[PDB]
Design an enzyme around this catalytic site. Structure first.
Site, PDB file in Angstrom:
ATOM      1  N   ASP A 155      27.694  23.755  47.159  1.00  0.00           N
ATOM      2  CA  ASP A 155      28.628  23.813  46.066  1.00  0.00           C
ATOM      3  C   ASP A 155      30.030  23.839  46.622  1.00  0.00           C
ATOM      4  OD1 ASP A 155      29.353  23.747  43.457  1.00  0.00           O
ATOM      5  OD2 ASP A 155      29.076  25.839  43.135  1.00  0.00           O
TER       6      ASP A 155
ATOM      7  N   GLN B 247      32.032  38.915  38.718  1.00  0.00           N
ATOM      8  CA  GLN B 247      33.430  39.221  38.924  1.00  0.00           C
ATOM      9  C   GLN B 247      33.689  39.478  40.400  1.00  0.00           C
ATOM     10  OE1 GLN B 247      34.899  41.815  35.278  1.00  0.00           O
ATOM     11  NE2 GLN B 247      33.013  42.636  36.201  1.00  0.00           N
TER      12      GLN B 247
ATOM     13  N   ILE C 188      40.100  40.570  40.299  1.00  0.00           N
ATOM     14  CA  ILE C 188      40.789  39.429  40.868  1.00  0.00           C
ATOM     15  C   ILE C 188      40.496  38.199  40.006  1.00  0.00           C
ATOM     16  CG2 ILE C 188      40.989  37.942  42.858  1.00  0.00           C
ATOM     17  CD1 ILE C 188      40.091  40.244  44.616  1.00  0.00           C
TER      18      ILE C 188
HETATM   19  C1  LIG Z   1      41.132  36.936  46.823  1.00  0.00           C
HETATM   20  C2  LIG Z   1      39.705  36.887  47.197  1.00  0.00           C
HETATM   21  N1  LIG Z   1      39.200  37.331  48.340  1.00  0.00           N
HETATM   22  C3  LIG Z   1      37.841  37.027  48.252  1.00  0.00           C
HETATM   23  C4  LIG Z   1      36.784  37.244  49.124  1.00  0.00           C
HETATM   24  C5  LIG Z   1      35.554  36.776  48.747  1.00  0.00           C
HETATM   25  C6  LIG Z   1      35.388  36.086  47.529  1.00  0.00           C
HETATM   26  C7  LIG Z   1      34.087  35.519  47.129  1.00  0.00           C
HETATM   27  C8  LIG Z   1      33.894  35.022  45.851  1.00  0.00           C
HETATM   28  C9  LIG Z   1      32.679  34.451  45.545  1.00  0.00           C
HETATM   29  N2  LIG Z   1      31.668  34.388  46.411  1.00  0.00           N
HETATM   30  C10 LIG Z   1      31.831  34.903  47.642  1.00  0.00           C
HETATM   31  N3  LIG Z   1      30.810  34.758  48.516  1.00  0.00           N
HETATM   32  C11 LIG Z   1      33.035  35.467  48.040  1.00  0.00           C
HETATM   33  N4  LIG Z   1      36.393  35.860  46.692  1.00  0.00           N
HETATM   34  C12 LIG Z   1      37.579  36.331  47.090  1.00  0.00           C
HETATM   35  N5  LIG Z   1      38.770  36.237  46.414  1.00  0.00           N
HETATM   36  C13 LIG Z   1      38.942  35.604  45.156  1.00  0.00           C
HETATM   37  C14 LIG Z   1      39.863  34.598  45.036  1.00  0.00           C
HETATM   38  C15 LIG Z   1      40.089  34.028  43.819  1.00  0.00           C
HETATM   39  C16 LIG Z   1      39.341  34.376  42.699  1.00  0.00           C
HETATM   40  N6  LIG Z   1      39.500  33.691  41.474  1.00  0.00           N
HETATM   41  C17 LIG Z   1      38.292  33.202  40.777  1.00  0.00           C
HETATM   42  C18 LIG Z   1      38.567  32.260  39.626  1.00  0.00           C
HETATM   43  N7  LIG Z   1      39.844  32.509  38.992  1.00  0.00           N
HETATM   44  C19 LIG Z   1      40.047  31.655  37.824  1.00  0.00           C
HETATM   45  C20 LIG Z   1      40.920  32.353  39.942  1.00  0.00           C
HETATM   46  C21 LIG Z   1      40.853  33.432  40.979  1.00  0.00           C
HETATM   47  C22 LIG Z   1      38.417  35.402  42.870  1.00  0.00           C
HETATM   48  F1  LIG Z   1      37.666  35.808  41.821  1.00  0.00           F
HETATM   49  C23 LIG Z   1      38.213  36.026  44.070  1.00  0.00           C
END
Ligand SMILES: Cc1nc2ccc(-c3ccnc(N)c3)nc2n1-c1ccc(N2CCN(C)CC2)c(F)c1
Length: 339
Positions: A152, A37, A30
């Site tokens: 953060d 990641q 994602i």
């Molecule tokens: C789509 C999606 N569902 C998610 C559920 C949890 C998390 C998450 C990420 C980090 N720490 C925790 N505690 C939970 N992330 C989720 N994502 C998600 C959404 C968007 C992105 N990105 C990251 C940066 N990128 C440039 C744009 C999209 C992702 F990596 C995960």
């Protein structure tokens, strides 16, 4: 690289279609962050998509993620109906030398939402929905048994639950702590960093409210309110809008002189061009009387002068220099902005 499986940033090299532990089918990456990641996986066992945060195979990230697991599990002992806007950690496991945190699947972060507005903002109505949820989330974190400071908050760490609803959740408790922990300093992301942290002072859950005030303005204008290129520029940009911090605070700030000096009349001022203190009015940033940010909301329902004045008031209360008087989540929720 860990029996083959790692890149040179200590990330797991995702292979689309891989099955793990006869349970998860990895679909795709994602996104990446500092920590590692997040991949999309299908959980055969629960029959649902999950977002697996694969932490870098590096001690510092592993250790941060273990703190994150602890805090998420603690939050879970409370929020079993997932009422309070924190991403649900389903489980965690070590896999191929990477700690894996299995989350519910969410959607775009608010930064990416702002990107889709071309950094021109979402409606005040949407801003209000995000604000109400975020204040409720802060309300939750401040429950005594948790007393969790996210540390953060920023648009990237607030995610839509899905692309057609306004529901959001906070993610990423890697940098988080509980009240009374003070070992962390130069914490928070710079744009969203509270004065007390900029000043090297004791801090509490109010730092998150500062971040939220910054975030809410940004959600509506499309642009970071205080986009410092470093701490000095940050404090300067804060001062541009909010004026010189109270003397009683500056007299107590170990890092006062990073930013400020006392003038011969014994008053505090900046050391160093910027708009003079307090002269970049939120009144104008928000376009209270001039059709909202850049005049772009002129006419639109829900963008009245009265609405903006309420929003401005709430924001100024979130951006109180004084963390003792900064509006707390409960009172934020009772603000007229949300009537
Ligand atoms: C789509 C999606 N569902 C998610 C559920 C949890 C998390 C998450 C990420 C980090 N720490 C925790 N505690 C939970 N992330 C989720 N994502 C998600 C959404 C968007 C992105 N990105 C990251 C940066 N990128 C440039 C744009 C999209 C992702 F990596 C995960």
């Amino acid at each position: 690289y860990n029996d083959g499986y790692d890149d040179d940033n200590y990330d797991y090299i995702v292979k689309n279609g891989e099955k793990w532990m006869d349970r998860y089918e990895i679909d795709s990456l994602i996104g990446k962050g500092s920590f590692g990641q997040v991949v999309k996986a299908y959980d055969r066992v629960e029959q649902e998509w999950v977002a697996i945060k694969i932490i870098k195979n590096k001690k510092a990230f592993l250790n941060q993620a273990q703190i994150e697991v602890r805090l998420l599990e603690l939050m879970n002992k409370h929020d079993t109906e997932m009422k309070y806007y924190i991403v649900h950690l389903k489980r965690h496991f070590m896999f191929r030398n990477h700690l894996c945190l299995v989350f519910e699947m969410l959607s775009y972060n608010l930064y990416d939402l702002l990107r889709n507005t071309n950094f021109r903002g979402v409606s005040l109505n949407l801003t209000r929905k995000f604000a109400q949820q975020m204040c409720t989330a802060l309300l939750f974190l401040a429950t005594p048994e948790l007393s969790i400071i996210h540390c953060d908050l920023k648009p990237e760490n607030i995610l839509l639950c899905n692309p057609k609803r306004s529901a959001i959740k906070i993610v990423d408790f890697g940098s988080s702590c509980q009240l009374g922990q003070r070992i962390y300093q130069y914490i928070q992301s710079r744009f969203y960093r509270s004065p007390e942290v900029l000043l090297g002072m004791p801090y509490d859950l109010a730092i998150d409210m500062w971040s939220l005030g910054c975030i809410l303005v940004e959600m509506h204008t499309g642009e970071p309110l205080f986009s410092g290129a470093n701490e000095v520029d940050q404090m300067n940009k804060i001062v541009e809008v909010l004026g010189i911090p109270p003397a009683h605070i500056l007299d107590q700030a170990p890092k006062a002189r990073k930013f400020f000096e006392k003038l011969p009349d014994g008053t505090w001022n900046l050391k160093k061009e910027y708009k003079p203190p307090g002269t970049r009015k939120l009144h104008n940033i928000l376009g209270v009387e001039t059709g909202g940010p850049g005049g772009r909301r002129a006419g639109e329902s829900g963008h009245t002068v009265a609405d903006y004045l309420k929003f401005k008031d709430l924001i100024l209360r979130m951006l109180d220099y004084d963390p003792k008087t900064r509006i707390q989540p409960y009172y934020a929720l009772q603000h007229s902005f949300f009537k």
